[PDB]
Design a protein around this motif. Structure first.
Motif, PDB file in Angstrom:
ATOM      1  N   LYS A 125      76.377 139.268  -6.360  1.00 11.73           N
ATOM      2  CA  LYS A 125      75.170 138.327  -6.146  1.00 11.73           C
ATOM      3  C   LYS A 125      74.759 138.260  -4.923  1.00 11.73           C
ATOM      4  CE  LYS A 125      72.182 135.570  -7.845  1.00 11.73           C
ATOM      5  NZ  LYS A 125      72.790 134.369  -8.608  1.00 11.73           N
ATOM      6  N   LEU A 126      75.595 138.124  -4.033  1.00  9.95           N
ATOM      7  CA  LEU A 126      75.362 138.102  -2.465  1.00  9.95           C
ATOM      8  C   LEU A 126      74.442 139.219  -2.054  1.00  9.95           C
ATOM      9  CD1 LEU A 126      75.761 135.360  -1.509  1.00  9.95           C
ATOM     10  CD2 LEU A 126      78.066 136.349  -0.659  1.00  9.95           C
ATOM     11  N   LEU A 146      80.664 136.329   8.211  1.00 10.96           N
ATOM     12  CA  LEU A 146      79.390 136.128   7.106  1.00 10.96           C
ATOM     13  C   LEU A 146      78.646 134.697   7.150  1.00 10.96           C
ATOM     14  CD1 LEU A 146      79.916 137.725   3.755  1.00 10.96           C
ATOM     15  CD2 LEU A 146      77.923 137.861   5.159  1.00 10.96           C
ATOM     16  N   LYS A 147      79.480 133.545   7.098  1.00 15.36           N
ATOM     17  CA  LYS A 147      79.068 132.429   7.474  1.00 15.36           C
ATOM     18  C   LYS A 147      78.248 132.168   8.539  1.00 15.36           C
ATOM     19  CE  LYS A 147      80.447 127.508   6.697  1.00 15.36           C
ATOM     20  NZ  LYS A 147      81.922 127.036   6.453  1.00 15.36           N
ATOM     21  N   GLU A 148      79.070 132.267   9.882  1.00 17.87           N
ATOM     22  CA  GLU A 148      78.571 132.198  10.948  1.00 17.87           C
ATOM     23  C   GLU A 148      77.233 133.023  11.003  1.00 17.87           C
ATOM     24  OE1 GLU A 148      81.116 131.319  14.163  1.00 17.87           O
ATOM     25  OE2 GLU A 148      80.845 133.273  15.117  1.00 17.87           O
ATOM     26  N   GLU A 149      77.182 134.354  10.826  1.00 24.94           N
ATOM     27  CA  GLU A 149      75.883 135.200  10.902  1.00 24.94           C
ATOM     28  C   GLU A 149      74.733 134.603  10.072  1.00 24.94           C
ATOM     29  OE1 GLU A 149      74.802 138.273  12.880  1.00 24.94           O
ATOM     30  OE2 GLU A 149      76.649 137.580  12.665  1.00 24.94           O
ATOM     31  N   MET A 150      74.802 134.119   8.834  1.00 23.13           N
ATOM     32  CA  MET A 150      73.873 133.665   8.130  1.00 23.13           C
ATOM     33  C   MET A 150      73.450 132.276   8.775  1.00 23.13           C
ATOM     34  SD  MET A 150      75.675 134.288   4.156  1.00 23.13           S
ATOM     35  CE  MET A 150      74.396 133.232   3.386  1.00 23.13           C
ATOM     36  N   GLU A 151      74.247 131.458   9.566  1.00 22.79           N
ATOM     37  CA  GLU A 151      73.971 130.325  10.153  1.00 22.79           C
ATOM     38  C   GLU A 151      73.039 130.721  11.313  1.00 22.79           C
ATOM     39  OE1 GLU A 151      77.784 127.419   9.497  1.00 22.79           O
ATOM     40  OE2 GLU A 151      77.719 128.724  11.298  1.00 22.79           O
ATOM     41  N   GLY A 152      73.248 131.900  11.701  1.00 21.45           N
ATOM     42  CA  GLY A 152      72.029 132.506  12.834  1.00 21.45           C
ATOM     43  C   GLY A 152      70.874 132.798  12.162  1.00 21.45           C
ATOM     44  N   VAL A 153      70.690 133.212  11.210  1.00 24.87           N
ATOM     45  CA  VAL A 153      69.603 133.628  10.480  1.00 24.87           C
ATOM     46  C   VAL A 153      68.734 132.494  10.004  1.00 24.87           C
ATOM     47  CG1 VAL A 153      68.573 134.217   8.216  1.00 24.87           C
ATOM     48  CG2 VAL A 153      70.373 135.888   9.679  1.00 24.87           C
ATOM     49  N   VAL A 154      69.501 131.445   9.367  1.00 23.81           N
ATOM     50  CA  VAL A 154      68.742 130.074   9.475  1.00 23.81           C
ATOM     51  C   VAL A 154      67.955 129.751  10.706  1.00 23.81           C
ATOM     52  CG1 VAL A 154      69.131 127.722   8.708  1.00 23.81           C
ATOM     53  CG2 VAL A 154      70.180 129.572   7.338  1.00 23.81           C
ATOM     54  N   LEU A 183      78.654 130.137  -0.167  1.00 18.55           N
ATOM     55  CA  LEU A 183      77.567 131.231   0.733  1.00 18.55           C
ATOM     56  C   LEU A 183      76.595 131.842  -0.233  1.00 18.55           C
ATOM     57  CD1 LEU A 183      80.063 133.929   2.382  1.00 18.55           C
ATOM     58  CD2 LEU A 183      78.614 132.097   3.722  1.00 18.55           C
ATOM     59  N   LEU A 184      76.946 131.767  -1.558  1.00 17.41           N
ATOM     60  CA  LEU A 184      76.000 132.107  -2.644  1.00 17.41           C
ATOM     61  C   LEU A 184      74.590 130.915  -2.398  1.00 17.41           C
ATOM     62  CD1 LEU A 184      78.353 133.012  -5.392  1.00 17.41           C
ATOM     63  CD2 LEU A 184      75.907 133.817  -5.245  1.00 17.41           C
ATOM     64  N   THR A 185      75.065 129.454  -2.497  1.00 15.33           N
ATOM     65  CA  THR A 185      73.989 128.594  -2.504  1.00 15.33           C
ATOM     66  C   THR A 185      73.073 128.643  -1.005  1.00 15.33           C
ATOM     67  OG1 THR A 185      75.971 127.045  -3.213  1.00 15.33           O
ATOM     68  CG2 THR A 185      73.802 126.106  -1.845  1.00 15.33           C
ATOM     69  N   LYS A 186      73.840 129.291   0.017  1.00 17.76           N
ATOM     70  CA  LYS A 186      73.272 129.265   1.490  1.00 17.76           C
ATOM     71  C   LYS A 186      72.041 130.491   1.351  1.00 17.76           C
ATOM     72  CE  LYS A 186      76.195 126.812   4.725  1.00 17.76           C
ATOM     73  NZ  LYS A 186      76.554 126.872   6.016  1.00 17.76           N
ATOM     74  N   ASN A 187      72.581 131.626   0.843  1.00 16.37           N
ATOM     75  CA  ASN A 187      71.801 132.577   0.650  1.00 16.37           C
ATOM     76  C   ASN A 187      70.789 132.451  -0.227  1.00 16.37           C
ATOM     77  OD1 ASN A 187      73.066 135.634   1.733  1.00 16.37           O
ATOM     78  ND2 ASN A 187      71.570 135.838   0.035  1.00 16.37           N
ATOM     79  N   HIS A 188      71.093 131.720  -1.243  1.00 16.00           N
ATOM     80  CA  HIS A 188      69.834 131.384  -2.238  1.00 16.00           C
ATOM     81  C   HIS A 188      68.918 130.517  -1.763  1.00 16.00           C
ATOM     82  CE1 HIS A 188      67.728 130.837  -5.895  1.00 16.00           C
ATOM     83  NE2 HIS A 188      67.911 129.553  -5.853  1.00 16.00           N
ATOM     84  N   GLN A 189      69.323 129.396  -0.667  1.00 16.52           N
ATOM     85  CA  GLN A 189      68.486 128.694  -0.101  1.00 16.52           C
ATOM     86  C   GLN A 189      67.364 129.509   0.935  1.00 16.52           C
ATOM     87  OE1 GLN A 189      70.671 125.808   2.023  1.00 16.52           O
ATOM     88  NE2 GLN A 189      71.392 124.690  -0.175  1.00 16.52           N
ATOM     89  N   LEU A 190      68.296 130.345   1.681  1.00 13.93           N
ATOM     90  CA  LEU A 190      67.475 131.257   2.574  1.00 13.93           C
ATOM     91  C   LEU A 190      66.521 131.954   2.064  1.00 13.93           C
ATOM     92  CD1 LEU A 190      67.485 132.626   5.657  1.00 13.93           C
ATOM     93  CD2 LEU A 190      68.973 134.369   4.322  1.00 13.93           C
ATOM     94  N   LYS A 191      66.683 132.442   0.736  1.00 21.18           N
ATOM     95  CA  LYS A 191      65.700 133.301   0.000  1.00 21.18           C
ATOM     96  C   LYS A 191      64.667 132.377  -0.249  1.00 21.18           C
ATOM     97  CE  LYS A 191      66.354 134.432  -4.063  1.00 21.18           C
ATOM     98  NZ  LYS A 191      66.938 134.784  -5.404  1.00 21.18           N
ATOM     99  N   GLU A 192      64.714 131.489  -0.942  1.00 18.53           N
ATOM    100  CA  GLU A 192      63.480 130.567  -1.267  1.00 18.53           C
ATOM    101  C   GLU A 192      62.848 130.042   0.255  1.00 18.53           C
ATOM    102  OE1 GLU A 192      62.076 130.050  -4.199  1.00 18.53           O
ATOM    103  OE2 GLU A 192      63.426 131.625  -4.559  1.00 18.53           O
ATOM    104  N   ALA A 193      63.429 129.765   1.206  1.00 15.96           N
ATOM    105  CA  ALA A 193      62.974 129.673   2.565  1.00 15.96           C
ATOM    106  C   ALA A 193      62.187 130.657   2.983  1.00 15.96           C
ATOM    107  CB  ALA A 193      64.126 129.213   3.308  1.00 15.96           C
TER     108      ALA A 193
END
Lengths: 41, 73, 43, 72
Positions: free
Chosen positions: C15-16, A15-23, B18-28
């Protein structure tokens, strides 16, 4: 808790890696959008 | 335990990150989409201007040629 | 796996999941506009 | 309470779905990026073409004008 913690750990790492790819893709997308503004000058 | 397996506190930790990041991504992404809209409107206006400007010189040219024909014959 | 941990784990997970639903929403909007770009040159 | 808490099995299952969803999201953004590059090159090309056609017309207009006044 092997096979479960082990599994959750694996899944949380993917999950972490994958979201890094989205960013990554968003960053690029923002860059292209920047150039677009430069097109209209 | 295994170095390469999370303890429960480490699990929770990863989750919070992961919560933090995902939230960041949303706003981004929200900011990205507003940018898309803005560029779209900019390009829309700009292409339209390009068309008008061509149209003008195209008609000017046409009329100049019509006049050239009518006033030579 | 303990009660406290699972509860917090479940709360994070929901939440995720929810946050992701909004992200794909944005993705959809992005796609909508991208489609519209294709028609700017066309008259 | 008890219902509103996931089991380890269930948590794992969400992880799989969430990963899948994120993968689709990433791949869809890759394609978007590619499409935007396309749109960008198309628009660059287009405007260059408009400019050329424009100053063609502008040249044709002036040449029709001076050539008209060239007689007499």
């Amino acid at each position: 808790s092997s096979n479960t913690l082990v599994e959750m750990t694996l899944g949380m790492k993917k999950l972490k890696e994958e979201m890094e790819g989205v960013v990554k893709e968003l960053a690029e997308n923002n860059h292209i959008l920047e150039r677009f503004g430069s097109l209209t000058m | 335990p295994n170095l390469d397996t999370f303890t429960p506190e480490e699990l929770l930790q990863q989750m919070k990150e992961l919560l933090t990041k995902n939230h960041q991504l949303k706003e981004a992404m929200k900011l990205n989409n507003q940018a898309m809209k803005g560029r779209f409107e900019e390009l829309s206006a700009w292409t339209e201007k390009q068309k008008e400007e061509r149209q003008f010189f195209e008609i000017q040219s046409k009329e100049a040629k019509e006049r050239l024909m009518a006033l030579s014959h």
